[PDB]
Amino acid sequence: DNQFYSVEVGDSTFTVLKRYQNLKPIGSGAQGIVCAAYDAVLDRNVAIKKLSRPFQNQTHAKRAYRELVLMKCVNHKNIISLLNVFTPQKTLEEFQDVYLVMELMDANLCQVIQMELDHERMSYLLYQMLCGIKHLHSAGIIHRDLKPSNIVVKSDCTLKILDFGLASFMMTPYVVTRYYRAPEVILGMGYKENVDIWSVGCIMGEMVRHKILFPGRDYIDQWNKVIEQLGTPCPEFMKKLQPTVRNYVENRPKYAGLTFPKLFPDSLFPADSEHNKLKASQARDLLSKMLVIDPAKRISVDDALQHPYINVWYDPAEVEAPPPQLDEREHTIEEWKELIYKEVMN
Ligand SMILES: Nc1ncnc2c1ncn2[C@@H]1O[C@H](COP(=O)(O)OP(=O)(O)NP(=O)(O)O)[C@@H](O)[C@H]1O
Numbered sequence: 001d002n003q004f005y006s007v008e009v010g011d012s013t014f015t016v017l018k019r020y021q022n023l024k025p026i027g028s029g030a031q032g033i034v035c036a037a038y039d040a041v042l043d044r045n046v047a048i049k050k051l052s053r054p055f056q057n058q059t060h061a062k063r064a065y066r067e068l069v070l071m072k073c074v075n076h077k078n079i080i081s082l083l084n085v086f087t088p089q090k091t092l093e094e095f096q097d098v099y100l101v102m103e104l105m106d107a108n109l110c111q112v113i114q115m116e117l118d119h120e121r122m123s124y125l126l127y128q129m130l131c132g133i134k135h136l137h138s139a140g141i142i143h144r145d146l147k148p149s150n151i152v153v154k155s156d157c158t159l160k161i162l163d164f165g166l167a168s169f170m171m172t173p174y175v176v177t178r179y180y181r182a183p184e185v186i187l188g189m190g191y192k193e194n195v196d197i198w199s200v201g202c203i204m205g206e207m208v209r210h211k212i213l214f215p216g217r218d219y220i221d222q223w224n225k226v227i228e229q230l231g232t233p234c235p236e237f238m239k240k241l242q243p244t245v246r247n248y249v250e251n252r253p254k255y256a257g258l259t260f261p262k263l264f265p266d267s268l269f270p271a272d273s274e275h276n277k278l279k280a281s282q283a284r285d286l287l288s289k290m291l292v293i294d295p296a297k298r299i300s301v302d303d304a305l306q307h308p309y310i311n312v313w314y315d316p317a318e319v320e321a322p323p324p325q326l327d328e329r330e331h332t333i334e335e336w337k338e339l340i341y342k343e344v345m346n
Pocket residue numbers: 026027028029030031032034047049080102103104105106107108149150152162
C-alpha cells in the first residue's frame with residue numbers, strides 16, 4: 001500500500017509516486033538525472049528530474065532551493081512549469097532526495113542547433129526566449145547563464161527555459177559551460193538586464209553557424225575568441241573594467257574585427273526567395289546588435305522584441321505579462337536541508 005515504487009534507471013534508482021509510469025532516461029546534468037514518464041492521474045506525459053542529495057553542498061543547495069521557489073511563483077508560457085514536487089522519505093532525518101515533475105518537452109536547443117531552421121521557426125524560437133527572459137526580468141530575475149542545454153522545445157516549435165540562472169567550489173566529475181556568458185561575467189564587471197541578450201546572440205549565432213561561436217578551455221581562451229571575431233572593444237568600455245582586469249585586456253593583442261556579413265555570410269542563411277533575402281539581412285542585423293561587447297552599446301530585450309525579425313510575433317499577453325522572500329543568502333548544509341524539506345513539503 002506504499003505510495004511509491006522503485007525502478008533502476010541507468011545506474012541510479014528512481015523512487016517515484018505510483019502515478020508515474022514507465023520511466024525513460026531522457027537527460028542528465030550536474031544536479032540530477034531527468035526521466036520522461038506517464039502520469040496516470042493527469043493522463044499525460046511528464047518529465048521527472050531527481051535531485052540526489054541537493055543539500056550536500058551550498059552551491060547545489062542554493063540552486064535547488066531557488067529553482068523550487070521560483071518554478072512555483074513564476075507563471076509564464078516560456079518558462080518551464082512545475083507540476084508536482086515530492087520526496088519518498090517520510091521525515092527530515094531520513095530526507096535524501098527531491099523529485100521535480102514538469103511538463104514534458106521533446107528536445108534541447110542543442111538538438112535544434114544541429115538542424116537547418118527556416119526564418120519562421122528561428123525567429124519564433126528567438127521571440128520566445130526573449131519573451132521568457134523579459135518575464136524573468138520583470139520578476140527581478142536576471143539569468144546570466146542561458147545555454148542551449150537549458151532551453152527546451154516541443155515539436156510544434158513551442159519553447160521554454162528550464163533553469164533560473166546564477167544567484168562556488170564544486171568537487172565534481174563534470175564540466176560547466178561558459179560559452180554563452182557575457183563579457184560582464186567573463187571579466188566580472190557588474191551587469192544589467194541586457195546581459196542575457198549576449199547569451200541570446202551566442203545562441204542565434206550558433207543556430208545559424210551550426211557550431212559554437214566563442215569556445216575555450218578557460219575564460220582566457222574564450223575572451224580570445226570574442227575579440228578575434230568582433231574585435232578589441234572601444235576605449236570607453238575598458239575604463240569600466242577593474243584595474244587588474246583592465247590591465248590584462250588593454251595589454252592583450254589588438255584586433256580590428258570582422259564584420260557581420262563576414263562572420264555570418266549569406267551561405268548560412270536561406271537566401272533563395274526574396275522573402276528569405278530580406279529576412280537574412282534582418283537576422284544578421286539583430287545578431288549585430290546582440291553580439292556587442294559593450295553593454296552600453298548592446299541592445300535591450302524590449303528593443304530586440306521590436307526588431308523587424310522578431311516583432312512579427314509580438315503579442316501583449318506574451319510580452320507584457322504580469323510578474324509576481326529575499327533569496328541571495330548564506331547557510332550550512334543541514335540548514336539548507338531543512339529549508340529544502342519545508343519547501344518540498346508545503
Ligand atoms: N521538462 C523537460 N522536458 C524534456 N526534457 C528535459 C526537461 N528538463 C530537462 N530535460 C532534459 O535533460 C537535460 C538535462 O536536464 P537539466 O535540468 O538541465 O539537468 P541539470 O543537472 O540542471 N543540467 P546542467 O545545465 O548540466 O547543470 C536537458 O538538456 C534536457 O535535454
